[PDB]
Design a binder for this molecule. Sequence first.
Ligand code: FDE
Ligand code: FDE
Ligand code: FDE
Lengths: 450, 115, 453, 453
Amino acid sequence: IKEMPQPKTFGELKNLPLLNTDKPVQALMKIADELGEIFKFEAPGRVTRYLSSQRLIKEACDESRFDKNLSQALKFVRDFAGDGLFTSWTHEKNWKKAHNILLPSFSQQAMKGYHAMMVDIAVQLVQKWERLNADEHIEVPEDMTRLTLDTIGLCGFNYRFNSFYRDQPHPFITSMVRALDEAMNKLQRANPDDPAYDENKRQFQEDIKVMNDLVDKIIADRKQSDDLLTHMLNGKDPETGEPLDDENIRYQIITFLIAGHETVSGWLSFALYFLVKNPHVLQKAAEEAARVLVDPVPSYKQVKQLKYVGMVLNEAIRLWPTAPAFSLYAKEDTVLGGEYPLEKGDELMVLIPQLHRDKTIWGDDVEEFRPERFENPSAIPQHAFKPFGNGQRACIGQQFSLHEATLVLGMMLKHFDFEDHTNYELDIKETLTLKPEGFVVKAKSKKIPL
Amino acid sequence: MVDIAVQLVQKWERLNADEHIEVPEDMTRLTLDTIGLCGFNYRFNSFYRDQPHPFITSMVRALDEAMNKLQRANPDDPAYDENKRQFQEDIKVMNDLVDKIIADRKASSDDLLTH
Amino acid sequence: IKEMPQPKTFGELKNLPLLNTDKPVQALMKIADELGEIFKFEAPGRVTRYLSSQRLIKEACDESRFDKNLSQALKFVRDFAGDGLFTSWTHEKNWKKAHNILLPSFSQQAMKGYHAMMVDIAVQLVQKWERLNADEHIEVPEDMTRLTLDTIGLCGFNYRFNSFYRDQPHPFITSMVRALDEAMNKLQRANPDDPAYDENKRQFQEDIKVMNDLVDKIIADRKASGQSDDLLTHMLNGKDPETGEPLDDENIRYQIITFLIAGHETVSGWLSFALYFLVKNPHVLQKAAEEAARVLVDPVPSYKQVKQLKYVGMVLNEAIRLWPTAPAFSLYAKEDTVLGGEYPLEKGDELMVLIPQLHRDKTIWGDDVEEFRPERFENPSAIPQHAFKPFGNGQRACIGQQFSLHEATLVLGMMLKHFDFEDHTNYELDIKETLTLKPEGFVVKAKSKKIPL
Amino acid sequence: IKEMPQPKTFGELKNLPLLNTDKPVQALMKIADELGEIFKFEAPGRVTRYLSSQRLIKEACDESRFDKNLSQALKFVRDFAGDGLFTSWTHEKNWKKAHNILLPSFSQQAMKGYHAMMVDIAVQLVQKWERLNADEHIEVPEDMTRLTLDTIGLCGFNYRFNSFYRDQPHPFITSMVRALDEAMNKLQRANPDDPAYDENKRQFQEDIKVMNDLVDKIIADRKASEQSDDLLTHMLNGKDPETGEPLDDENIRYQIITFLIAGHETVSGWLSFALYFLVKNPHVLQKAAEEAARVLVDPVPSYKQVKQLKYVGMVLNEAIRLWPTAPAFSLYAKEDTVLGGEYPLEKGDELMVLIPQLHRDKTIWGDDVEEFRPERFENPSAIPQHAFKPFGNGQRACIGQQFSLHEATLVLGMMLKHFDFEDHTNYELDIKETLTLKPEGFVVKAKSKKIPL
Ligand code: FDE
Ligand code: FDE
Ligand code: FDE
């Protein structure tokens, strides 16, 4: 039962200066590489422990001892998402209520309903790229969020953002980035009440009104369908017989627009990066897509058969998990790993990109992109691969993402050949999530019609 | 009372043609200004404000807290630390406003506060 | 005498660094104090000469030799005021057309029509100040912009901004301040295409959208739903004698913006400075409150009574002499000429009149040019021509001079009748500069004289 | 019985944002004008109460209940002034020790010895101005630091700084202003250990080494042969009457720094202000030059002649009244006490005397506190006790008080004898704040009266 490592302190500022970058998650990974499986991290008022090894995280994922915690990041995001599924505490009224009301919308059969609409937007993406003249290129992260925002909008709410009819980023997304960017910058503000932050605070509200105005436009377009929005309005709580409060329903819409398109958007962009940097892996998935997608538009069953594309997807999110961390707190007093005592209420952070690079589980080539590690999904021991959270607070849209990413990635491989014409150097922008910045490619159409 | 009521009428007469009226927000503007003037000779000037008076926001959040504590199973859950904080933040603002009313009289009547 | 004075130069940046302050006009007032009646001012790409003495200003006011120029300041205001009266060239189409169409709206026959609506806005201010609690104070420039904006909206467009029902400045006022502040800061950018200014370049546009969204709201309440005889009917219905046609809807919108801005912003500064000199010169305040008690004998002021507030008008004039809230106007050389017999000008050379400096000429105003003595205006005829130019010059002079002076006189009259004013902080005059001038933190406390309305 | 006023608060930062300007003392003077005779000012770890009225300052100057305190400003200057006379606690061994040995260096008999050296520096200033060409001007605070620094150098240590042979300031003054400004800016830092201030910490230390490299130059040039009878002789050889010992090598090092800084910086500010009031108040300037022409009848003035320039001293007294170049001094409560019968104080609580605010108490000086009226100082006996405190209080009052006034009169006497001064720029007073006060960018022109030396 020994003492815990800790990085450099700056007097009364503690460890806060060490995350004084636009890339805090990558700075924590360096500290993890420098200090190991666990280290203590102090801020003016907060203290947290970062876990990097599967040995300690395996006990942290035990729901008998640990419960989902709202990190200082989520408490700031709660300023515009409120008590929706992502930023809710487990033991507060609306998490249980809404979790059970929304869960039918993510069943395997609900996915069959989404498929036609997912195919709608994916065809729009293929048609955008097929109409590029020979000199033009593609901005990967921008066209992916065009697609992922449109999917969550059409399937969830029957609302058309028409992102492909906008050369500019969609206004909802542009202020959302600023709101998520603001939240992350507040984690680095020592004294958030300095007058210097008065422009920053007023812009922050300006961006929330933009997010709420769109939601009221989504609500006004309804009040003919059995989508996710019908379920928010109509589902009863079995114990009380009542539907979700209107203020919560606005909160869940925001949550799904954000969590339901950004992490999928980063995902697809990373998968395209690793393919275009590993050209043999790209032709093996291109062979599978040419084999399985035999129709002008894909069917639901065909997506289920793109086994190798799926492994590409799992190996990308292993290397770069687009939601990079989740937080826990100590239900009751306990000792961690038989060496580290924790009092009730002590907080842990699972550093997901560090868990997925644990040499002791994945072998001594953790940093290489090898999709063939997931040819045997069962081989990997429990709690070693945690890109979607843990337990009852794990990602509810866990199958929706996989189907959307697989379908979209499948059709791109069927219809285009991709050249990394600039020799792109991977640069990971951090909002609270991860995405490659300025990643561009060229796509020669294989001239297969739709 | 007529003082406050005339202020409300004049607010509605000066709206432009396309605008509308949110009734409970303008009613709280009227009734609160009335208790302030009649009770304490104190002018909240609620109709000279766009958003609610800060006393009104802290009061409703305090009343909302009181009602929500009734439905709460496990009152020490970490989910409620913000609530305990915010509750105490809302107590100080209501007392501060009462400190402003009491002190504003030590300057200066035969109203409720005089009794 | 032949060579022209010029301040310190900074390499390929010329004189531009000299204006790196939040207060550029007062910084120019100090260069003139050091260099005299005229000096050359170079920035990367532009050159202008600043005039300060009545001797040269009288020559520049010769309309046969000089015409109104769009200073670099106004060219940037033209990005949202467009082709309106203020930012229009004399010889381009929509100036003379709009001027002839709109001049009837500022005759003093129209002023009597506006008077009832101006009284409306003014009573709302009196009632705000009477309803403050004992400990409260007043923010002077903030409450003056509420009144001046509400007056131009109601009299000009039959529109109510309802600024006294709003805690914060009205949304138009907030974007407009940022648009003027963006303009003022653009005069200092060595490279306006630098990526550093992308948030500025985008923020600037967001604020243009807000002002035009209000202009759409005013026209939405008119050119559909209804019969007024205000400024806007004249914009929609007046015709041009040479062409027979009214103004294009695009220009009308530019004219609405210009009247919202130039018609309240300069006025709110006027009242704030006038009230500043009053609480700093209490005997001038006593004499003005005596005329106000005498003339304003009814519960509400009439048009005839305002025309009789003579000492108040001298205060207002002595205020605008010290701090002319639109602080400069620009001119250029129609043809080659020599100015003052020593400084030649090629055709097209630009001159800028430094109004606060011309108003501080000792050779004209005597030896107490900085004292606030309203009695210098006791016989308005005694002043030399081109000695007092707070409202511009020639045919491009301020079209709203009789409108502003009437508005400023009426409101200052009612405050003096209804309140006693305390400079409870010993306010030190700190004058914020957008493109207009107003004091920044001026506050007072006001004891009500308990006179009914 | 009364709660104490406090200005606007900013969350956990308390009042600290309010002084985030380049002019914190002038910002506190403003806060005093709104909040009155005493207000509490909170910072994250510290609390201080600012006094402005003679009513409360007379009690703070009571040495049985209050003793000199080190404000946060002096605690930072103690980082390079160390244990010297200014930054020591009165209960420290080195204070009474250094006071008793150095106090003789300022007895009247010494002034006669310094007088010859003082004249040397001043004659250099007169002839510097006599050698300016006609178009050139004079930088007032820049030449005054040249004089006072050279004077303390020659009178104190027999060391020639030769400032009039210098480009821009000496390396000591150049390094010292940065050290004093760093000290002033450390007062605004929410968290000092922040990495952003590493360039500042590096630069602050680099400037401390420069100043010591000069005291070491002075010490080495002295013990290299040594029968002087100056202040440095007393530091090295005099023994303390109470303890029989002389000063530490470490402490002699700290006093040399102490005397070079506070002993020229406040004198230079003083003289710049007096010259500002002279060129802005032309009636007092003629009376001062008519007396100086009267008394200074020799090629050089004698000690006896300077002691007779009564009106010149009155100007100096009225200058330092309005702008005490050392703007504040700090006190703490020996034991629990009640201040003003209204505000209770715990033992050790900190008070700040706001000297420019004390000198503007209309209840003591009359209703013309902003007027430069030297005749308040004609019969000093009328002046109520503790109303005029430009040199501190009690046993911790300014030790060089007579030294400074005599130097200031001598120089001010000679400038007036030899020159008429033109305020050719209409300089607008701008008060730069290091930890001391001086006018920034004050310039004049001086036509020589052509009187030989
Ligand atoms: C719609 C959708 C879509 C999606 C996607 C995704 C991707 C790609 C990735 C991801 C992730 C995730 N998630 Fe995700 N997602 C979603 C969602 C969600 C929600 C609602 C949540 C929360 C849940 C609960 O709690 O109930 C999540 C959730 C999630 C998580 C966890 C959180 C915490 O904090 O714990 C993670 C890690 N997600 N994700
Ligand atoms: C409504 C209104 C109001 C007003 C006011 C005023 C005041 C207080 C002051 C003033 C001023 C002036 N203006 Fe003034 N104002 C107005 C207006 C105007 C207009 C529209 C103009 C333009 C004209 C022409 O050109 O046509 C002006 C204008 C003006 C001027 C000139 C500018 C230039 O550049 O030239 C001046 C200086 N204004 N202002
Ligand atoms: C040499 C010299 C010169 C001078 C000058 C002067 C002038 C002009 C002004 C002045 C001032 C003064 N000071 Fe001055 N001075 C000097 C000095 C000094 C010293 C050493 C001191 C210390 C003392 C004790 O004891 O602490 C002083 C001191 C002094 C003071 C006090 C501080 C406190 O905190 O208490 C004051 C306020 N001074 N000052």
